[PDB]
Amino acid sequence: MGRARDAILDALENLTAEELKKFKLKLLSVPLREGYGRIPRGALLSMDALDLTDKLVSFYLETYGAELTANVLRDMGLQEMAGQLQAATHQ
Amino acid sequence: MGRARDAILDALENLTAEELKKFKLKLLSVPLREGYGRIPRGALLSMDALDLTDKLVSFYLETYGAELTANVLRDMGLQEMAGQLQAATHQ
Amino acid sequence: MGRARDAILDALENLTAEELKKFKLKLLSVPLREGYGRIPRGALLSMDALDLTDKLVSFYLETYGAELTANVLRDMGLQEMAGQLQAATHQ
Amino acid sequence: MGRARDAILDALENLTAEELKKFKLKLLSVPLREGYGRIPRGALLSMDALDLTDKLVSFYLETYGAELTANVLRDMGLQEMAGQLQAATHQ
Amino acid sequence: MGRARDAILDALENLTAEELKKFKLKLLSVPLREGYGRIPRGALLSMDALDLTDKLVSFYLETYGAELTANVLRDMGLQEMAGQLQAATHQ
Amino acid sequence: MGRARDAILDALENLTAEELKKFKLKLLSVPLREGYGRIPRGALLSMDALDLTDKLVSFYLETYGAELTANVLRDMGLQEMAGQLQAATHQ
Amino acid sequence: MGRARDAILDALENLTAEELKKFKLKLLSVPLREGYGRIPRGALLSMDALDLTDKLVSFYLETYGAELTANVLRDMGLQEMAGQLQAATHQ
Amino acid sequence: MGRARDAILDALENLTAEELKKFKLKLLSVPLREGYGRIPRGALLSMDALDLTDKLVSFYLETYGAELTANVLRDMGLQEMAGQLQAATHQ
Amino acid sequence: MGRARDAILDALENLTAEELKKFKLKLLSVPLREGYGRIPRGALLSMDALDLTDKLVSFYLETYGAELTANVLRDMGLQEMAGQLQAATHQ
Amino acid sequence: MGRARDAILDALENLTAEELKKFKLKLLSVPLREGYGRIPRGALLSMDALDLTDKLVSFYLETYGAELTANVLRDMGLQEMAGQLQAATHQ
Amino acid sequence: MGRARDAILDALENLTAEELKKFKLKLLSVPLREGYGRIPRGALLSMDALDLTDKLVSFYLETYGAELTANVLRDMGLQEMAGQLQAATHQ
Amino acid sequence: MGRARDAILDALENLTAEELKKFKLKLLSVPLREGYGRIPRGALLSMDALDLTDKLVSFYLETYGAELTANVLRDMGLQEMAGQLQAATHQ
Amino acid sequence: MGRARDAILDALENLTAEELKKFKLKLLSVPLREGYGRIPRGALLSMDALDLTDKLVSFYLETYGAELTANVLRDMGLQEMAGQLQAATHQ
Amino acid sequence: MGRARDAILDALENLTAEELKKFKLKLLSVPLREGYGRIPRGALLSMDALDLTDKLVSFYLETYGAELTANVLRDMGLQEMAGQLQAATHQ
């Protein structure tokens, strides 16, 4: 199996309990590519980091999951974690 | 078979674990059209979203089930979920 | 032979294991027209869906069997199955 | 056949699994008028709502069964279900 | 020929597969009037409802058979079938 | 189905979590008219607003439940909420 | 015939299925007086309450069967059933 | 049947979940009179209030069960519940 | 015989107890081609993964069963299991 | 001699006992061509797979028997057994 | 007589009932060598471990039966039981 | 008949459901004396306390069964039940 | 049998519930040696420590199971636990 | 049974939620006498005062459990509670 389910985790474990809430909230309205579903609010607003990584790799694929996570992280301002995630995923 | 069972599921899965309890509680006293039964309290206060959608579509019909769910959601305040459900059901 | 023995089966097979028990219990006290016997308690509380349909069509005629099944199903609130049964049997 | 086997069911399905256990426990020590037996503890501690209603109407007659159910429900506090049961059975 | 042979059947067909065994067990120890024999344990613990009714009406008389069946049903707790049998047999 | 179950909820939702504890505590010693039970401590000291409304409408009736809630709210000082509840319930 | 075949039932029927298995297991190692056989393990671990009472009264006598049942019931802790069984059998 | 099985419940429902664990823990080491068994630890640390009352009235008798519950409640500090239980049981 | 009965299992065994229920629920209303029956609701809402795969390959053929499972999995959002299912079945 | 009795046999042995009862029940109401009799209920509701195949090939002919059993299997939902049966019988 | 009928048993008795169903399911679609028949689905989905071993050694020979069991165990994941079976069979 | 089948039960009944699963798991890898068999994994991971005691006394004799139970309890940490079992068994 | 099933357990019981979730998550994407299967996601995300150890020793052998557990523990950071496991396993 | 399971509780309920964590942490490294096991981290870092007392008196005996608790309490500075525990235990 691909390692992308780990590189996401290392990016979502560096977020404090305050930035994780913001990440989950931003995940509710980020534009999505065609053919991909959206996580329901009831489950999204209660998952912790681990379930979030699992469901991100589940709904989307490894490549698109990593790209979406990086885009959301750069959207909220945190570019250190976003840069680390992009570096880990690309090569 | 009507697709309104999926529309109700897509609306009841966007409610938090606390809003679902409110929905189930309001379902106990909402006025009902004549000839339609009322869900017993013993099972109402224990079902999750999936069982709730199934039993809602079973007890009432597709059209009346969607209408009742929209009315209950509108009553409790959530104006976005009711709008989405009405848009999905009407056309 | 009449097809009413198949419409009842398609309706009693759509009930979960808990609703079938309720159906069998309510079959013990539903009002009956004159000239029609009542299913004994000893055998009724143990039959599955197939035996129940067979005994319903044997004790009661096809028209009255379907009508009684629809009435009992509508009494307990399950009206999707009742409407399906009425549509199947009337025409 | 009398309808008392139904009005009891509607009383026992409107209370959750938590106080159904309390109802079954109270049924072991409720005072009984002479000539009526007591439900054995071996089955009473595992019977669900449907079986409980059936056994209540079987051991106890319709009038006394409804009266005993109403008295037990009133004893444990729930006076809405007790009121509904009295209204249904009395007239 | 006596009609109460039917009524006993109507009383023993309302017993599920469980309390029929209990009825047969109580038939081995119920007190008996003088001049009446006891059913041997070898064949009693294997008969169904029909054979049980036939042998009950054979060993004892029609009136005493009905009375004994009613007494055993009353002693084991079932006070509805016993009342129904008494109503059927006395008049 | 009375609407008094919804009027109480609106009364128990506009008060903060700090005074919900005070309301539940005052509910333990409020005088009660004869024939009505008292909610046990073990359950009472743990239910939130929704279960509290359900239990209040269950143990007492609609009219008495609303009156008791209004009286308790008036006792703890909140005159705005008691007035709103009385206005909703009376007409 | 002896009535102790009934009282024994009244002891083995008011205990749950979880402790019936414990009773049957403990019946395997209880000491016995001389001249009395032991119930075979193959049949003992499968009988229900009724067969257990019948076999207990068959293998042992009325008095010794009741006494052994009371002793075993005391050994497993249940003293209410043992007390009522002794009260029934002694006089 | 004695009513003391009802008083004990009224004493075990007036203490919160945290105090129930303490009660069950102190029940593991309270001194017992001779001839009375001790509840096994495996089942004692998992029962709720209802099963606890049933087991207490089962292993011990009505009077000793009430007395032991009162003594344990007094030892663990709760004097109000112990006094209420003693008042309910003694007269 | 065809190997697609193994791939479907490999897709249905990667779902937790929660989205398996969603899969079963959405299997009740997915559009079907002509000549293909619909799984009865009574048995569908109780099967585990293994029975579900067996029945899916039974009612629908190898290719259509795999395609329907893939479509349903895509509809609920899980496009990781759907992707591998399509990869396995197509070649 | 015609080997259609083997195709019917190995088609009816690929379905569980639960589906065999459904097959036997639906055999009671399937439409029949003129000149062909109907299997009586007395034997139909008791035969196992082997003598069922024997009776199907006896009452009807090889071609008509295979066609009828294929139609019944198709109607009750199993499209996999029906397809292989048609493939075997046609050529 | 060969001992492979025992080595298979020790392999099919050391796995829980959850993966016994998986074993029986995968036995329906595993590739088979030429000249070897397939176990009918009607009986296969109901046998326990002992009947399964007997049928495996009857349909397939000792060596091929052991080899097929080892292959099926390997495919489903369990490589501890498969290694034990290979060690017991080969030498 | 030895009493060691009881001392084991008292040892396996004073430990909660969490330690019972650990006990059963450790029973799969404990070193065994020569000439004694090992309990198969299929049945071991599903038996409760009573079945576990029966099988322990069946496979291993009284002395070795008690000694093995004491050793397993000691190895898994519980030094109180192990000491109690040793005291009960040795003298 | 080998002692390796005990070394793993002691490693998995010394990490809290939050690290067990991380361990089970990293078990979904760890590289695997050829010929070894992967634990299905549906069952993996719900097992506790004991079931996890059982499955780890089941799918992978003792040596590879311990090695993989140590590798995952080092990957997720815990170096004390991995060192203890390696010391227990190697000698 | 010894009273050491109570005095230990009296020493652990006088600890606020802060130094209880310190007590549980220091319980992970306190030297142990030979023959006694160590509580795993998985449970030690989540158990409350009552579970802690139960597991302390379970893993160790009464005398050693009390002595070890006193030693740990004295180690972390709290001498009032250690002195009280010693006074309660020794005499």
Sequence-distant (6+) residues with CB within 8 A of M4 are M57, M62, M63, M65, M66, M89
Q: Which of A20, A25, A51, A45 is nearest to B14 (CA)?
A: A45
Query: Alpha-carbon torsion J40, J42, J46, J50, what sign?
Result: negative
Mapped to the 3 state alphabet, what secondary structure does chain E carry? CCCHHHHHHHHHCCCCCCHHHHHHHHCCCCCCCCCCCCCCHHHHCCCCHHHHHHHHHHHCCHHHHHHHHHHHHHHCCCHHHHHHHHHHHHC
User: Rounded to whole angstroms, what are the CA distances from E68 to E4, E18, E50, F74?
Assistant: 12, 20, 17, 66
Say which amino acid occupies D15. Answer: L
The Cα B57–Cα B50 span in angstroms is 11
Residue G82 near residue H61, CB atoms below 8 Å: no
L25 touches chain K (CB under 8 A): no
The Cα C2–Cα B80 span in angstroms is 51
Residue N5 near residue N62, CB atoms below 8 Å: yes
**Least CB–CB distance from F45: residue in H12, H16, H49:** H16
**Least CB–CB distance from L6: residue in G21, G26, G45:** G26
Residue A49 near residue A13, CB atoms below 8 Å: yes
The Cα N39–Cα N32 span in angstroms is 11
The Cα C5–Cα C61 span in angstroms is 10
Q: Does an H or E element contain H81, and which? A: helix H79-90
Alpha-carbon torsion, ordered D3, D6, D12, D14, to 10 deg: -120
- Other CB atoms within a 10 A radius of the CB of residue J12 amount to 23
The Cα B67–Cα B32 span in angstroms is 11
Q: What angle do CA C16, C22, C23 make, to 5 degrees?
A: 85
Phi, psi of E15 (to 5 degrees): -100, 130
User: Rounded to whole angstroms, what are the CA distances from G20 to B74, G16, H60, L14?
Assistant: 54, 6, 19, 18
Number of H helices, E strands in chain F: 6, 0
Residue E19 near residue E76, CB atoms below 8 Å: yes
I43 touches chain C (CB under 8 A): yes
**What fold is seen in the domain I4-29+38-90?**
Death Domain, Fas (1.10.533)
Find the distance separating the first CA and the last CA of chain M, reported in whole Å: 16
List CB contacts (< 8 A) between I41 and chain C.
13-16
Phi, psi of I13 (to 5 degrees): -90, -5
* Residue I30: DSSP 8-state: S
Residue I47 near residue C21, CB atoms below 8 Å: no
CA N79 to chain centre: 14
The Cα G55–Cα G23 span in angstroms is 14
Q: Which of H24, H49, H50 is nearest to H39 (CA)?
A: H24
The Cα I65–Cα H1 span in angstroms is 61
Q: Which of C47, C54, C42 is nearest to C20 (CA)?
A: C47
Find the distance separating the first CA and the last CA of chain L, reported in whole Å: 16
J74 touches chain C (CB under 8 A): no
- Surface-to-core class of residue H90, CB atoms within 10 Å of its CB (0-12 exposed, 13-18 middle, 19+ buried): exposed
- Alpha-carbon Rg for chain G, nearest whole angstrom, is 12
With an 8 Å Cβ cutoff, are G38 and L1 in contact?
Answer: yes
* Residue H33: DSSP 8-state: -
**Least CB–CB distance from C5: residue in J28, J38, J45:** J28
B76 touches chain A (CB under 8 A): no
Residue J66 near residue C42, CB atoms below 8 Å: no
Sequence-distant (6+) residues with CB within 8 A of L82 are L11, L70, L73, L74
User: Rounded to whole angstroms, what are the CA distances from J43 to F51, H53, I62, J19, J51?
Assistant: 57, 55, 36, 18, 10
User: Rounded to whole angstroms, what are the CA distances from H47 to H39, H50, L21, N43?
Assistant: 11, 8, 19, 21
The Cα M64–Cα M55 span in angstroms is 13
* Residue G48: DSSP 8-state: -
The Cα J80–Cα J69 span in angstroms is 13
The Cα B33–Cα E37 span in angstroms is 65
Say which amino acid occupies E59. Answer: F
Q: What angle do CA I65, I67, I70 make, to 5 degrees?
A: 110
Q: Which of B39, B91, B43 is nearest to B66 (CA)?
A: B91
Residue G89 near residue G30, CB atoms below 8 Å: no
Q: Residue F59 has which token pair?
A: 């143990």
Sequence-distant (6+) residues with CB within 8 A of E61 are none
With an 8 Å Cβ cutoff, are F1 and B45 in contact?
Answer: no
Residue F66 near residue F85, CB atoms below 8 Å: yes
The Cα M19–Cα M25 span in angstroms is 10
List CB contacts (< 8 A) between J84 and chain K.
none
Residue carrying the six token digits 């590519």: A33
Residue F59 near residue F37, CB atoms below 8 Å: yes
State the nearest Cα–Cα gap between D57 and chain F, in angstroms: 25
The Cα J90–Cα E71 span in angstroms is 66
Mapped to the 3 state alphabet, what secondary structure does D26-84 carry? HCCCCCCCCCCCCCCHHHHCCCCHHHHHHHHHHHCCHHHHHHHHHHHHHHCCCHHHHHH
The Cα B33–Cα A18 span in angstroms is 46
The Cα B66–Cα B51 span in angstroms is 15
The Cα N72–Cα N74 span in angstroms is 5
The Cα L9–Cα H43 span in angstroms is 13
- Other CB atoms within a 10 A radius of the CB of residue M54 amount to 20
Q: Which of D48, I44, I18 is nearest to C18 (CA)?
A: D48
- Other CB atoms within a 10 A radius of the CB of residue J40 amount to 9
Chains in touch with L (≥3 Cβ pairs < 8 A): G, H, K, M, N
Report DSSP letters for L23-45, one per residue. Answer: HHHHTTTS---TT-----HHHHT
Query: Alpha-carbon torsion C41, C43, C46, C48, what sign?
Result: negative
Residue N73 near residue N82, CB atoms below 8 Å: yes
In sequence order, which ranges of chain L are alpha helices (DSSP H)?
4-13, 17-26, 41-44, 49-59, 62-75, 79-90
Residue L1 near residue G27, CB atoms below 8 Å: no
Q: What angle do CA C12, I17, A35 make, to 5 degrees?
A: 95
Residue L80 near residue N57, CB atoms below 8 Å: yes
Chains in touch with A (≥3 Cβ pairs < 8 A): B, I, M
User: Rounded to whole angstroms, what are the CA distances from N80 to F34, L43, N17, N30, N91?
Assistant: 51, 52, 17, 20, 17
Query: Alpha-carbon torsion A61, A66, A69, A71, what sign?
Result: negative
Q: What angle do CA B23, B26, B32 make, to 5 degrees?
A: 120
Say which amino acid occupies A39. Answer: I
Residue N13 near residue N49, CB atoms below 8 Å: yes
Closest chain C residue to the Cα of J39, Cα to Cα = C1
G15 touches chain D (CB under 8 A): yes
Residue G15 near residue D42, CB atoms below 8 Å: yes
Residue I66 near residue I89, CB atoms below 8 Å: yes
Residue G29 near residue L6, CB atoms below 8 Å: yes
- Other CB atoms within a 10 A radius of the CB of residue H25 amount to 21
List CB contacts (< 8 A) between L15 and chain H.
41-42
State the nearest Cα–Cα gap between I64 and chain K, in angstroms: 17
Residue C32 near residue C85, CB atoms below 8 Å: no
List CB contacts (< 8 A) between D41 and chain G.
13-16
List CB contacts (< 8 A) between J10 and chain K.
40
With an 8 Å Cβ cutoff, are L38 and M1 in contact?
Answer: yes
**Least CB–CB distance from D6: residue in C21, C26, C38:** C26
* Residue K72: DSSP 8-state: H
List CB contacts (< 8 A) between N54 and chain H.
25, 28, 45
CA J1 to chain centre: 19
The Cα G80–Cα E82 span in angstroms is 30
Chains in touch with M (≥3 Cβ pairs < 8 A): A, I, K, L, N
H36 touches chain N (CB under 8 A): no
C21 touches chain E (CB under 8 A): no
Sequence-distant (6+) residues with CB within 8 A of C15 are C23, C49, C78, C81, I41, I42
With an 8 Å Cβ cutoff, are N1 and H45 in contact?
Answer: no
Residue H82 near residue H90, CB atoms below 8 Å: no
Closest chain C residue to the Cα of I39, Cα to Cα = C14
* Residue H27: DSSP 8-state: T
CA D91 to chain centre: 18
The Cα G45–Cα G56 span in angstroms is 14
* Residue J34: DSSP 8-state: T
A30 touches chain M (CB under 8 A): no
- Domain D4-90 classified CATH 2.30.110.10? no
List CB contacts (< 8 A) between C12 and chain I.
42
Residue carrying the six token digits 């250190």: A80
- Other CB atoms within a 10 A radius of the CB of residue J28 amount to 17
Alpha-carbon torsion, ordered F3, F9, F14, F18, to 10 deg: 160
B17 touches chain I (CB under 8 A): no
Q: What angle do CA A55, A61, A65 make, to 5 degrees?
A: 70
Query: Alpha-carbon torsion D26, D28, D33, D36, what sign?
Result: positive
Report DSSP letters for chain B, one per residue. Answer: --SHHHHHHHHHTSS-HHHHHHHHHHTTTS---TT-----HHHHTT--HHHHHHHHHHHS-HHHHHHHHHHHHHHTT-HHHHHHHHHHHH-
Say which amino acid occupies H47. Answer: M
Residue A5 near residue A57, CB atoms below 8 Å: yes
User: Rounded to whole angstroms, what are the CA distances from G75 to C37, G22, G78, L1, N11?
Assistant: 52, 11, 8, 16, 36
Closest chain C residue to the Cα of I43, Cα to Cα = C16
**Least CB–CB distance from A45: residue in B10, B16, B49:** B16
Q: Residue L85 has which token pair?
A: 């079992």
With an 8 Å Cβ cutoff, are H61 and G79 in contact?
Answer: yes
D59 touches chain E (CB under 8 A): yes
I89 touches chain K (CB under 8 A): no
N91 touches chain M (CB under 8 A): no
With an 8 Å Cβ cutoff, are B1 and I26 in contact?
Answer: no
